Ligand binder design. Structure first.
Ligand SMILES: C[C@H]1[C@H](O)[C@@H](O)[C@@H](O)c2nnnn21
Ligand SMILES: [Ca+2]
Ligand SMILES: [Ca+2]
Ligand SMILES: [Ca+2]
Length: 1038
């Protein structure tokens, strides 16, 4: 019975929280208080992750520094308390929130990259020549190969040049100080159209431009390169193209190839016009459209376009290099290169002429788990099974040894890996052998490709580099993930994992096959830091690899301002349920070690502030968690339904596809109005800015996941990869099926897109599997698909609802479930039509738990239609089996500071003269009486409507609890509690911390004990409305 699960949910259905210990400031008192608070809210467990240590926050006097006996004692006490209370625990595989580092790791055991040095020497009899040492992270380096290259031309790779600049932005409403300029350090800055000019003594032949930045700068990659011989007639060379890039893009410079150009003068023209708005695969374009360049280096030696990325040193995608840029003349044949490893100071004999001595080897990338404290150190080598095992043994395994082994064996059931923040890597000591087994040929002779030196042809080079990247991503799965999965089963743990993309070269779906619990992430009020693409990686991964529980780190808030409460979290949560998550993890519960300070310790103001010292914790968090649990009991039932699978291609890196990127492929499915708004948005005219949250200025045409509810207008889709196609896909009854229950009718092979611009050719195997699926009846539409839907092919929309209604559909042996959620902040009445023929629908309310088994419905064209009224932000589940107030005076007690006042009229606290009410945050108890004339009749239902509630209210009538009201409709069923005559009305109203913190900031604190390390505040500088504002009314229905 689904009803037993909805009314009595199982433990799997409960939401969890991340629990962050800050700066080693931890106490047993606070531990007990936190774990009891979590139990009281109805949480299932917590992930215990310490962040930073004493050194990073000396002011807090921490005594529980990571890995000290005192810290381990606190971990033990937490396990003991979680055992007592019936909570489960997880921990991360390292200290801090990312990723797999620790002080036990040496440079040799860390993430490795290919490095090199060179010198030009005359050939002949070389004896005892000392070659320059390549990059050696903390002295660690190891040679791999030494190559001898014949010199192409004989001139310097770079020459000196006189650098000038000029503003050209005319249309004079301009701030003259923000026009182009070069500072003392040679750094170039501009906000306005301009050019930077380089004048050489003699004509210089340039084939590429290395752009060197100080942090990220989208606009630096948008320069238009021009050249001249005579200083006035300038010819176009190339409009540069930004590579796709994530947020961790500063480990390498960027090389832009150009057609070989010989000139005395080069100009780089810039304008902000034509900028793409920001996204997760052009992270730098989220920021202000200002130009900032540390150095442009113009080079002579041929290099592949955007080679740093193509070599796998950083996560990047760009087009193959054109033949106009790298012709066969520009590439070295294998027979031209002499391999001098064996001789290697160097003593050997080369032919005559001049030779380049490319000394190649490997060193650490230098990445650490930087948010750790006592457990901080180098990131483990991600391709080395032993280093990965070692990392497991030294942190996570130790929680079963250093605490209390029998208690740890019962409560510590979850091992987590968060989202990658340790860059990329492209070598390890097993990498040549792995490449050979997997790709079927030897990489070693082609090692100079990893320096972007072209060999044989531009195409052969880039085909090989793609293979390197493919191997890289395969090894993240087959080593790092495989090893941790084995370790997890060995310790009887479930394995949760977040995204690898867009920081480590990877197929972003691929690793989810190895984990029990794929985990996405969604942010609150943080468009610059939100990760909708991560969400779709985790969901798509779970769906294609058959993982039924999909966790999500939810409500992460880049700057929390203390005005947040469950009411304004609901719509955000509901649209992520619509995407397919079904176990929320709250981000974040911060341990507050002091019982006398509130709201206390935070992650330096990064929200959501989800913890015991919230004004609304005791009643608000519990009510919300009840909603969540009921929602999740049903959203974990059976299998998700999606009719459309979309192939993610054969470029590397790769990941799930965002809805926006499919609009030119399926313009019909999205509709003409979506096509039109995308063209306006992407044209990004004037590069408009928005500030959200306070102090975060960014591109206003950023794709906003709130504007992409139900984007395929009644269908759902998963991204789907080569591995799933080749290893798992089956045709059954006209649909493509996978183990775990995915069944798709349609397979979209998208048009070339930003993340797959070539696009990479389909391998013969893929072509062969696609053809088998065409023949077994699977729709593989011709693109662009221009019809409104797939009903011409007998595939109707699953749910027809109006815009701004989020939904999902699950199906199992006991029937069908549609989750339907209003995203607008208004009451709406609308028809929902479901693809269900001849079964009786019911309406199950996840806020109250009420089940209405007898709703009206029509049956038309073999669908079922229902009329729904949804209050602001209201959600429902559709399940298919297989008169004013006349009150006496109010007594209002403000419990935090004991004030009590009498009032006839309801009032906004923030408008009172008394500063202890004006600035009050917390709970106030309202007490009054009312007359009810008649006895409550049969079939008759009575609601106390609260009107406007700031922000949360618990209703007691004649001492009977009639519920905690936190979202619309703001009303309480008082039917069972009503008596004839005089009724007693008690209402507890709770607001948010914002007003009290504003009071405390200004010396007008409404009570003592107010402190937090969270410093961010709303820009508005206003007191929020607060209280039972009403008006109060009764509603008598049937
Ligand atoms: C706030 C932390 C958060 O706690 C972590 O999940 C980490 O993945 C991250 N990425 N950006 N910001 N964070
Ligand atoms: Ca994360
Ligand atoms: Ca493709
Ligand atoms: Ca794309």
């Amino acid at each position: 019975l689904l009803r037993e699960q909805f009314q009595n949910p199982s433990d799997e259905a409960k939401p969890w929280t991340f629990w962050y210990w800050m700066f080693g400031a931890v106490s047993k008192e606070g531990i007990t208080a936190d774990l009891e608070a979590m139990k009281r809210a109805g949480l299932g467990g917590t992930y215990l992750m310490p962040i930073k240590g004493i050194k990073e926050g000396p002011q807090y006097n921490g005594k529980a520094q990571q890995l000290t006996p005192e810290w381990w004692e606190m971990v033990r006490f937490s396990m003991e308390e979680a055992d007592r209370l019936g909570l489960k625990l997880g921990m991360h595989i390292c200290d801090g929130f990312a990723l797999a580092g620790g002080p036990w790791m040496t440079p040799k055991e860390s993430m490795q990259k290919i490095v090199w040095s060179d010198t030009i020497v005359d050939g002949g009899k070389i004896k005892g020549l000392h070659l320059p040492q390549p990059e050696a992270y903390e002295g660690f380096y190891e040679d791999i190969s030494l190559f001898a290259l014949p010199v192409k031309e004989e001139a310097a790779d770079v020459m000196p040049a006189q650098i000038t600049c000029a503003n050209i932005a005319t249309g004079n409403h301009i701030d003259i100080k923000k026009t182009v300029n070069m500072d003392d350090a040679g750094v170039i800055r501009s906000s306005y159209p301009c050019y930077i000019q380089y004048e050489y003594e003699q004509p210089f032949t340039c084939r590429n431009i290395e752009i060197i930045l100080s942090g990220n700068n989208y606009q630096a990659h948008r320069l238009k390169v021009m050249a001249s011989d005579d200083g006035v007639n300038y010819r176009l060379v190339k409009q540069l193209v930004p590579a796709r890039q994530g947020w961790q893009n500063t480990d390498e410079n960027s090389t832009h190839a150009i057609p070989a150009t010989t000139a005395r003068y080069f100009r780089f023209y810039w304008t902000p016009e034509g900028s793409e708005p920001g996204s997760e695969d052009m992270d730098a374009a989220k920021w202000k459209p200002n130009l900032k360049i540390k150095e442009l280096r113009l080079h002579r030696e041929a290099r592949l376009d955007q080679w740093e990325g193509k070599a796998g040193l950083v996560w990047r995608v760009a087009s193959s290099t054109k033949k106009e840029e790298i012709g066969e003349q520009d590439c070295y044949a294998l027979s031209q290169i002499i391999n001098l490893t064996d001789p290697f100071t160097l003593t050997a004999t080369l032919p005559k002429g001049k030779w380049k001595l490319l000394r190649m080897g490997h060193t650490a990338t230098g990445h650490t788990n930087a948010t750790a404290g006592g457990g901080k150190g180098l990131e483990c080598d991600k391709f080395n099974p032993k280093a990965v095992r070692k990392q497991f043994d030294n942190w996570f395994a130790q929680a079963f040894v250093k605490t209390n082994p029998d208690v740890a064996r019962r409560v510590l059931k979850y091992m987590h890996v968060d989202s990658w923040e340790c860059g990329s890597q492209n070598w390890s000591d097993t990498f040549a052998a792995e490449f050979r087994k997997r790709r079927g040929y030897d990489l070693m002779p082609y090692l100079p490709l990893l320096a972007g030196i072209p060999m044989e042809s531009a195409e052969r080079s880039e085909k090989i580099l793609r293979d390197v990247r493919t191997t890289i991503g395969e090894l993240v799965v087959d080593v790092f993930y495989q090893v941790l999965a084995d370790c997890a089963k060995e310790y009887d743990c479930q394995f949760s994992a977040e995204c690898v993309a867009p920081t480590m070269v990877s197929d972003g779906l691929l690793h989810y096959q190895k984990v029990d619990l794929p985990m996405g992430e969604f942010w609150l009020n943080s468009p610059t830091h939100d990760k909708p693409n991560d969400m779709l990686d985790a969901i798509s991964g779970a769906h294609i690899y058959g993982k039924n529980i999909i966790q999500a780190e939810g409500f992460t808030e880049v700057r929390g301002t203390w005005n947040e409460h469950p009411g304004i979290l609901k719509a955000l949560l509901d649209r992520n349920y619509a995407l397919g998550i079904n176990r929320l993890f709250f981000h974040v519960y911060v341990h507050n070690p002091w019982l006398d300070r509130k709201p206390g310790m935070t992650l330096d103001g990064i929200g959501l502030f989800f913890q015991r010292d919230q004004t609304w914790w005791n009643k608000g968090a519990k009510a919300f968690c009840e909603y969540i649990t009921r929602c999740q009991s049903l959203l974990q039932y059976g299998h998700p339904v999606a009719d459309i699978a979309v192939f993610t291609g054969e470029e590397m890196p790769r990941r799930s596809i965002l809805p926006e990127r499919l609009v030119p492929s399926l313009p019909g499915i999205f509709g003409a109005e979506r096509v039109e708004s995308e063209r306006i948005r992407l044209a990004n005219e004037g590069q408009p800015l928005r500030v959200r949250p306070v102090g975060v200025t960014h591109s206003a045409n950023m794709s906003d996941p709130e504007k992409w509810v139900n984007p395929l207008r009644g269908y759902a889709y998963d991204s789907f990869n080569k591995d799933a196609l080749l290893r798992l896909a089956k045709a059954e009854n006209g649909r493509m099926t996978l183990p775990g229950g995915a069944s798709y009718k349609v397979l979209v092979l998208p048009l070339p897109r930003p993340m797959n611009p070539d696009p990479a050719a389909l391998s013969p195997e893929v072509k062969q599997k696609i053809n088998e699926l065409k023949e077994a009846g699977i729709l593989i539409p011709s693109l662009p698909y221009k019809e409104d839907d797939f009903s011409s092919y007998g595939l109707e929309r699953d749910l027809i609802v109006p815009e701004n209604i989020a939904w999902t559909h699950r199906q199992g042996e006991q029937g069908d479930i549609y989750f339907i959620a209003n995203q607008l902040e208004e009451t709406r009445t609308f028809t929902a039509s479901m693809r269900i023929d001849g079964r009786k629908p019911e309406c199950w309310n996840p806020v109250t738990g009420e089940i209405n088994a007898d709703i009206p419905y029509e049956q038309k064209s073999h669908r079922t239609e229902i009329t729904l009224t949804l209050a602001p932000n209201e959600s429902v589940f559709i399940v298919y089996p297989a008169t004013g107030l006349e009150a006496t005076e109010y007594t209002v007690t403000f419990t935090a500071n004991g004030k009590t006042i009498q009032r006839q009229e309801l009032f906004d606290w923030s408008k009172e003269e008394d500063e202890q009410i004006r600035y009050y945050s917390g709970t106030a108890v309202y007490k009054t009486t009312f007359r009810w004339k008649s006895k409550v009749k049969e079939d008759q239902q009575v609601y106390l409507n609260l009107g406007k509630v700031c922000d949360l209210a618990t209703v007691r009538v004649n001492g009977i609890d009639c519920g905690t009201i936190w979202t619309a409709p703001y009303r309480a069923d008082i039917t069972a509690a009503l008596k004839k005559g005089v009724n007693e009305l008690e209402i507890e109203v709770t607001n948010t911390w914002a007003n009290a913190l504003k009071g405390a900031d200004e010396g007008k604190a409404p009570f003592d004990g107010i402190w937090t390390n969270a410093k961010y505040r709303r820009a508005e500088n206003t007191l929020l409305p607060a209280g039972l504002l009403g008006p109060l009314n009764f509603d008598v229905a049937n």
